[PDB]
Structure formats: C-alpha cells, structure tokens
Amino acid sequence: PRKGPAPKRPLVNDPVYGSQLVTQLVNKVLLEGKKSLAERIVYGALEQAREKTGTDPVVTLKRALDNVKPALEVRSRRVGGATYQVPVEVRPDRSTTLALRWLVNFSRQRREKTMVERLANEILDASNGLGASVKRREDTHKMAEANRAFAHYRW
Amino acid sequence: TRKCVFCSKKGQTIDYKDTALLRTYISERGKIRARRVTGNCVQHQRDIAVAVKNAREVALLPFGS
Amino acid sequence: KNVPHGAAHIKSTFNNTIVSITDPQGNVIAWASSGHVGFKGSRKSTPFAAQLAAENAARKAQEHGVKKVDVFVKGPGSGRETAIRSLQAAGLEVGTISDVTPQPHNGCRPPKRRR
Amino acid sequence: GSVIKKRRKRMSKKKHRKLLRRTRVQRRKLGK
RNA sequence: GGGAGACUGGAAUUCCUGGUGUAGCGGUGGAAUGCGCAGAUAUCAGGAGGAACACCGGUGGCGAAGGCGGGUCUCUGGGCAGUAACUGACGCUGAGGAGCGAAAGCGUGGGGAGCGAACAGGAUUAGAUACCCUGGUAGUCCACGCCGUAAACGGUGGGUACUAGGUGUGGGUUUCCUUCCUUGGGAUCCGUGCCGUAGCUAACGCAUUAAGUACCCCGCCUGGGGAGUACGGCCGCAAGGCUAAAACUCAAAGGAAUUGACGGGGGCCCGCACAAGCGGCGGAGCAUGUGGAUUAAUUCGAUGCAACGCGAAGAACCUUAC
C-alpha cells in the first residue's frame, strides 16, 4: 500500500439467488476452506426465513443491511502525547462488508444450538431492527457523534 | 505597497482631536496597525502612533478593547 | 436559589481545568475542577477530564435552575473546546464565547528558562 | 580559531583565582 | 529611542479587607516536598506598594565607543543639504597625559511587587554539593561617590586620492513627458544592506563601506608551556587593576580546506513496518531444547536480533568424547 491502491477482485454472481450479497455473506461466514458447508448453511437460513416470514428474501436482506448500516466510523490517530478518536466518513462498500461481518458474528453469538436458524432469526429480527446488532450500531452512531469535538484534525 | 495617504498635497493634519481618523488606523482589539498594512511613510507612521498614544492618554480611545 | 441567566468561567492551564458557574454579579453557584471528578496527578490535564468536570459543574448548576450561560474562557489550551461542547451538551444555552486571558504590557519579570 | 586555547587560558586563570582565594587573610597579615 | 531634570498613564503580578463558594490547588517525564479544610484554588468589589513600558517595532533612526524607544513640559549636544556672504592653510596623526566607559562588586541613606547567587527540603542516580520542583537573603531600583574591567567583535587604528556594474532602504535639493493625483522618470550629496569584474589571499572570502592601487602618523607581533605568574613600583576602603621577567621543559603548538567514520542532527524513499483484515502464542495436558539445582558423571559446542524441534537426517549396548 506504499506504492498505490491495490486492485480489487471482482465478485462472482450467485448461481441460485443471483446476487453478490449472498456470495459475500457466505464468504464472510466461510471458515476452514469448506464452501459446501457454509453454502448449505446459508441456503438453510435463507429458506427458513422465507418459510417463516413468507416474504421476498432479497428485499428483506437489503432491508436488514440498511438497518445495520453504519454512517461515520471512528479511528485513532497519534498526536500531542495521546491518540485521539477522529471521525471519518465511510464509503458504502466498506460499510456493507463490515456490517455483514457484524451480523454474521452476532448470528454466531445467538444461543439456539445451531446457526442454520440463528442466521435466519438474525435476518428476520434485523428486518424489524430488534437484534443486538442494530442497537449496538445505534451505540456506534452515539459514540461517533459524541466525539465530534475532534472535527478539526480531519485525519 | 499602497502609497502614503498623508504624503499627498491634500492630506489631513494628524491630530489627537480627530478620533475617526485614528479609528481608521487601529485594529479591532485597539492595537496599532503596522505600516506594511497601510503603506504610509515612516514619519507619518510615527506621528500616527504618537497621536494614538496621546488619544489613549486623554481617554479618547480604549486601552486595548 | 433560582437564577435564569448566569455565566461560566473556564480556566485551562497545562496542569488543570477549573469550571465555575457564577451569577452575572460574580457570585459562584457551583464549581467542578479536573481533580474533583476522580483524576489524580498528571491525568487531570487531558480533554477527557475537562469534559467530565465541565458536565459535572453544568449539572450541579442546572440543579439550581440555570438556563442560558455566557462563557468566559482563560489560559493556554488544554480542554477549552471540549469544555464548551460539554456545557452545550449538558443542557445549557451558550450566548457568547469571550476569551479574557491576561496579557501584561511588559511589566514584572517572568521566571528563568528550564534546561 | 579553536576553543582549546581559550579553555587552557581559563583553566590557568581559575587556578590562580582559587590560589588567591585560599590565602587572603595570610596575605593581609604578612604584607603589613 | 542623543542627554539631563520634573510631573504623570494603563495593563499585569503580589498583598490586605469584604461578598459568593466548596474540597481540593500547585508541580512534573512521573512524582514528592508545599498551600488548604481554622475556609484554599476559583470568582466579584475596594485599597497599598514596587518595577518594566505589549501593539507601532524592522536588518529602521541617533551617538566617539559604552549605549538609547509609555506620555507631556523645561534646559542642552551632534549631523545633513542648499546659498556660497566671511577668514585665508589656520590641516593629519598624536608617545606620555586627561576624560568617558556594559554587567557584576564596594561605601553611606532610603526602597523592596516580581525575579534570584549563597542556603534549606523534594525528586532522579551506584553516588547529585547540578540540571527538574517548592521557599528564599544579598542583589536588581533611587541619591551621591569609588573599581575601570568583557567574545568592550566588523576578532578589520586614524586621514586623503584612484579602480566594471546590478539591486533594496533612510535624509535632502533639482530638470523633463506630465494627469504636475502620483516612488512617472532622470540628475545629484550623505548614510545603510545584498550580489557580483579586475586585483589580492594559504584557503575561506574581501571586493567603491576593500582584506585592491598609493602617501603620512600612532599602536602591536618574533615557537608552545612556565606566565599576564613571581619580584619591585603606582592606583584602590576591599575585590583587584596596571608595568613586567627568569630558572626549567617540549619537537612541536597552530590556520584553511579534502576524504571516510560517527551523532542520544535534520530531509526524502522503500519493506507484512505500521494501518485495514484472517489465523494464532502467553491460559491446561503432552513432546522436544535451554537456564537453574542435585549427582559418579549428568560429555562438549551454541547465548539479543543473527542461541534456545540448533551440531544430532535416529543416545537400551554400539554413538560415547562422561
């Protein structure tokens, strides 16, 4: 990253649901290098949500990502003997991928014994914004706008 | 560099009686301006400074508002 | 005591930050310093301590029912702006930010240099 | 020039100053 | 802002008195001495006292050099330009000598807010008679006298004439396109800076403000230490200053520039160096190596990075060196 920006690998469109969102989701929930396992897991969660709420899965996943959307990140920069928490605006792609990481981690945090329903439950409650992820995201905006005093460093 | 106002043949006589003329040459905090900002010659600059000090003395201008 | 309008004096140096809410006649209602909040030693110069002291003083003054505040600030820069934000967030209306810091006219003699 | 010569001169001078300091009363008594 | 005397202005610091007002304030890399809870810090109002003059303010002005800027009044020295009316060489330097001469210091009488040698604690350190923190006397100030020293430096004595220019600033007189508004421009006398010819220099650099080309006068130098010391003398209340050697000892002491190396000196540029991310270690058990301890021996080697699942890609005997 010293020379310049590095290229970004293009995303592969999904074969079944036809969205980069679901393949990004399975990639982030991917672990141990076993795409089949996580892939059938995300299929199970998708079909569970579809059969539970009886709605369109793609639109409710976009609704969930919009409800877990961050706005202004906080990053530490070193000056004057201390590290100050400067706020920085976030481009949409990083926000989306980190929010999806958040929702995957929080689905892993659910305690109903199997994630094939944990992730679906997280999807449906994020459609209502009732999970812990959305409240903690609200806390993130709380902190971001609470530390707005360091609006002059602009780091 | 702007020319000196008082170096003209039709300039005004510098005096501490006139407060607006000295109000021109003092800043928003009551301080005296430099002569690079104004461009007036050394002589007229020192007359302006002395006049401002006298005006402060006789209580016509604030001591650093 | 019930007073609608008052003032806030903030003094920030390289060692401490002291906030005091007063009447327009100068009588003090409540004060909170950077070490009264629970910071001891070198830590009471950081902006976090300034914010905590400012909000604590603002809350104590608000308990007496202060609505609008004219803030006078003083001293070098340790927690000036952070204190202003802390008062404005605690529920006080700022009317004017006036910086009255003493400035000698070449009187007295400052101490020597640190080597 | 260099400062080594200056500090040699200062060292000789300071030694003489200390020698003068050490024996003021004796010099006073002996001179009279 | 050249000097002397008198009167006088405001900000700020400290202190005292009286309100509001609570439990901390101060200081530092971090702290502790310290100041408070008997009312501190903070914040209002009043009073006392001393010292220095923010903005104008600069490579700008004045003075023989020291040096000189809050305001006003009184007394006073020097310089520059123009006219050239006046005297008629009355000039230059000047051994001795006299006068002035930063800061510190001494004497007599006041003053004393801030600052601060010496002096006390606190801190760091293997020790800190210091750097850092808290107090603090002389002194800093005034009146009148002494001493007479500095890197008192442009490390460059005074006077005069000559030798390419370019470019700023301070003070004053003149001609011409001229709006005579105007730094319009040119000419001219005295200063004050920058860059550059010839020339000079060991080089660095100086270069019309010469360290260039010449004349007059004064001061000073003759290897480094011993030594600006001893003796004699003059001056001083004292500290001390001024004039100024010898015995002896070394084979050198120095000035300028060059190339490397080094810096608890800077400036740039790279690298999974950080940053953004994923997965671990330090947590338990077990396997290997090492330090440490016993033992008859626990063979030897390897000790930041760059040794520690390393020589050893094979210790029941054999390896094996104990």
UniProtKB/Swiss-Prot annotation, chain A:
InterPro entries: Ribosomal_uS7, Ribosomal_uS7_bac/org-type, Ribosomal_uS7_CS, Ribosomal_uS7_dom, Ribosomal_uS7_dom_sf. Part of the 30S ribosomal subunit. Contacts proteins S9 and S11. GO terms for molecular function: rRNA binding; structural constituent of ribosome; tRNA binding. Keywords: Ribonucleoprotein, Ribosomal protein, RNA-binding, rRNA-binding, tRNA-binding. One of the primary rRNA binding proteins, it binds directly to 16S rRNA where it nucleates assembly of the head domain of the 30S subunit. Is located at the subunit interface close to the decoding center, probably blocks exit of the E-site tRNA. This is Small ribosomal subunit protein uS7. GO terms for cellular component: small ribosomal subunit. GO terms for biological process: translation. Belongs to the universal ribosomal protein uS7 family. The gene is rpsG. It comes from Mycolicibacterium smegmatis (strain ATCC 700084 / mc(2)155) (Mycobacterium smegmatis). It comes from the Bacteria. NCBIfam families: rpsG_bact (TIGR01029). The keyword Ribosomal protein applies. SUPFAM superfamilies: Ribosomal protein S7 (SSF47973).
UniProtKB/Swiss-Prot annotation, chain B:
Keywords: Ribonucleoprotein, Ribosomal protein, RNA-binding, rRNA-binding. GO terms for cellular component: cytosolic small ribosomal subunit. The keyword Ribosomal protein applies. GO terms for biological process: translation. One of its GO terms (molecular function) is structural constituent of ribosome. It comes from the Bacteria. The keyword Transmembrane helix does not apply. Belongs to the bacterial ribosomal protein bS18 family. Part of the 30S ribosomal subunit. Forms a tight heterodimer with protein bS6. Binds as a heterodimer with protein bS6 to the central domain of the 16S rRNA, where it helps stabilize the platform of the 30S subunit. This is Small ribosomal subunit protein bS18B. It comes from Mycolicibacterium smegmatis (strain ATCC 700084 / mc(2)155). The gene is rpsR2. The chain holds residues 17 to 81 of 84 of the full protein.
From Swiss-Prot, chain C:
Located on the platform of the 30S subunit, it bridges several disparate RNA helices of the 16S rRNA. Forms part of the Shine-Dalgarno cleft in the 70S ribosome. One of its GO terms (molecular function) is rRNA binding. Residues 97-115 are annotated as: Disordered. Keywords: Ribonucleoprotein, Ribosomal protein, RNA-binding, rRNA-binding. The gene is rpsK. GO terms for biological process: translation. Belongs to the universal ribosomal protein uS11 family. The keyword Amino-acid biosynthesis does not apply. The lineage of its organism: Bacteria, Bacillati, Actinomycetota, Actinomycetes, Mycobacteriales. Part of the 30S ribosomal subunit. Interacts with proteins S7 and S18. Binds to IF-3. This is Small ribosomal subunit protein uS11. GO terms for cellular component: ribonucleoprotein complex; ribosome. The chain holds residues 23 to 137 of 138 of the full protein. Transmembrane segments: none annotated. It comes from Mycolicibacterium smegmatis (strain ATCC 700084 / mc(2)155).
